[PDB]
Write a protein that binds this ligand. Structure first.
Ligand code: LMT
Ligand code: BNG
Ligand code: BNG
Ligand code: TYR
Ligand code: NA
Ligand code: NA
Length: 442
């Protein structure tokens, strides 16, 4: 009873729905902001092209060939071999990443609720920054909107692959892109465009001397592509032979990059027009954008539409996050999808609660030295587990497969592009990750 995408376009739009989410707007902005901007972006773009695309194709190939979960794919294609540690790490990353992903998405629903009830049709007396600090520091209020978002997440994963994940609305992501474009154009007119565009596209190579920039660039690349943890193995495991994987990987990588770049064109000219620091942190878009929406006449309608379309993109991403533990637990314990979605979704919600409290009453607590709970959970998943799982995945096809099977299953020949892809997995991508690890950690 293995489920398959009902529609022909279902797989590619699901992969696009998995990639495009909070990482393109919320995470891309604040990580680019504190990492220096343009020099980080160039390294980030280079990581997309040379590591992101091939390992995305690597995940599609493994999933479609094995027709199993992120862990069962390795047990099936190479029984009794150590490659399944990437599937195990990938399942754990699903727990950790979605635990805090639900919190940031709860921030979305809260802001949408405030616009729908008219609470943000003017700058609150304490300011848009003071409004944001007051909400995220509340111990209970973000939990309610986080729990509300997870209920929707679990509901769609429980309904199934054909009736749930696939049937998300096809106009909302294009409407999100059109809206970001319209906004990015508006922020160009606001006065901080020259300095904001120099920050984003004129590189200061002094920042590159710190190795941590490379680690953040590769963490954002793996994060924004839903990469390295078997999420695309799982989505690919639902598609049949009537599908071209190379174009799917480039389309997903191209669209996700376009969303990221246009988000930066919107955010940072707005950052500089406001005179705010680009290095503010995780609440950057939540302080900058409502202030930006407030200078528009119809801004409250822009805010409603923005956090509706942003919330819908976060929803399709959270669904693919929960889908990795659910498919793994459906097989290995004969759990029903509704049981696994509800049980694992409830547990992941509980795991995120400390990360939500980390923005307030637990703000002084550290797990990894110098990082609070939220920053620690993100670091182990995005900077450790995603890049390492991606390194294993690339080496698996590179050295654990025969080349003819690698090319045949990926719908490639022994062409220049086919040779380029096998070379990326054997050497370029995995040694780039290893070098990033070696230099960052002493
Ligand atoms: C889009 C999904 C819609 C789902 C339906 C939601 C309807 C149920 C409403 C529950 C949320 C309202 O609950 C109420 O919200 C307001 C903020 O909005 C909170 O207000 C409180 O927190 C905010 C956060 O900064 C402070 O600015 C404010 O000074 C403080 O009073 C209330 O303490 C909370 O009790
Ligand atoms: C896809 C549609 C995108 C349209 C975006 C155009 C919005 C730019 C509005 O500029 C604003 O209005 C006046 C110009 O008309 C200026 O005087 C004012 O300083 C400026 O803030
Ligand atoms: C809509 C996409 C447009 C992207 C263009 C962004 C280019 C960023 C570079 O900024 C430029 O840096 C120079 C100094 O480095 C300045 O002398 C110059 O005045 C400034 O313009
Ligand atoms: N790529 C998504 C987040 C994500 C990460 C990993 C996943 O497995 C799924 C989703 C984003 O940029 O918003
Ligand atoms: Na993304
Ligand atoms: Na999404």
């Amino acid at each position: 009873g293995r489920e398959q995408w009902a529609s022909r376009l279902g797989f590619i739009l699901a992969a696009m729905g998995s990639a495009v989410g909070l990482g393109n707007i919320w995470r891309f902005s604040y990580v680019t902001g504190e990492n220096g901007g343009a020099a980080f972006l160039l390294v980030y773009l280079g990581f997309i092209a040379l590591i992101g695309i091939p390992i995305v194709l690597a995940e599609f190939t493994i999933g479609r060939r094995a027709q199993s979960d992120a862990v069962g794919s390795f047990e099936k294609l190479a029984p009794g071999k150590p490659w399944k540690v990437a599937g195990l790490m990938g399942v754990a990353a699903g727990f950790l990443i979605l635990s805090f992903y639900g919190v940031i998405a709860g921030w979305i629903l809260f802001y949408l609720f405030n616009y729908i009830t008219g609470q943000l049709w003017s700058a609150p007396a304490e300011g848009f920054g003071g409004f944001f600090e007051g909400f995220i520091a509340n111990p209970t209020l973000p939990l309610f909107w986080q729990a509300l978002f997870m209920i929707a997440t679990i509901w769609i994963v429980a309904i199934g692959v054909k009736k749930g994940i696939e049937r998300s609305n096809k106009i909302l992501m294009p409407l999100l892109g059109v809206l970001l474009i319209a906004l990015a154009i508006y922020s160009l007119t606001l006065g901080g465009a020259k300095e904001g565009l120099a920050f984003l596209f004129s590189p200061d190579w002094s920042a590159l001397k710190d190795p941590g920039v490379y680690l953040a660039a590769i963490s954002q690349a793996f994060f924004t592509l839903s990469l390295g943890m078997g999420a695309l193995i799982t989505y690919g495991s639902y598609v049949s032979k009537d599908s071209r994987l190379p174009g799917a990987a480039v389309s997903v990588a191209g669209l996700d990059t376009a969303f990221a770049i246009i988000a930066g064109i919107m955010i940072f000219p707005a950052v500089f027009a406001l005179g705010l620091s680009p290095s503010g942190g995780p609440g950057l878009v939540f302080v900058v954008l409502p202030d930006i929406f407030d200078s528009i006449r119809l801004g409250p309608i822009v805010g409603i539409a923005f956090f509706i379309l942003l919330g819908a993109a976060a929803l399709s991403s959270a669904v693919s996050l929960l889908e990795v533990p659910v498919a793994y637990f459906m097989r290995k314990f004969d759990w029903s999808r509704k049981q696994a979605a509800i049980t694992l979704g409830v547990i992941i919600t509980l795991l995120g609660i400390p990360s939500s409290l980390s923005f307030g009453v637990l703000g002084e607590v550290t797990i990894i030295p110098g990082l609070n709970i939220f920053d620690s959970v993100d670091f182990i998943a995005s900077s450790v587990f995603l890049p390492l799982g991606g390194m294993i995945i690339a080496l698996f096809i590179g050295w654990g497969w025969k080349t003819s099977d690698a090319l045949a299953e990926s719908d490639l020949t022994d062409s220049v592009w086919g040779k380029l892809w096998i070379l990326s997995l054997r050497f370029i991508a995995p040694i780039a990750i290893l070098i990033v690890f070696l230099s960052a950690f002493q």
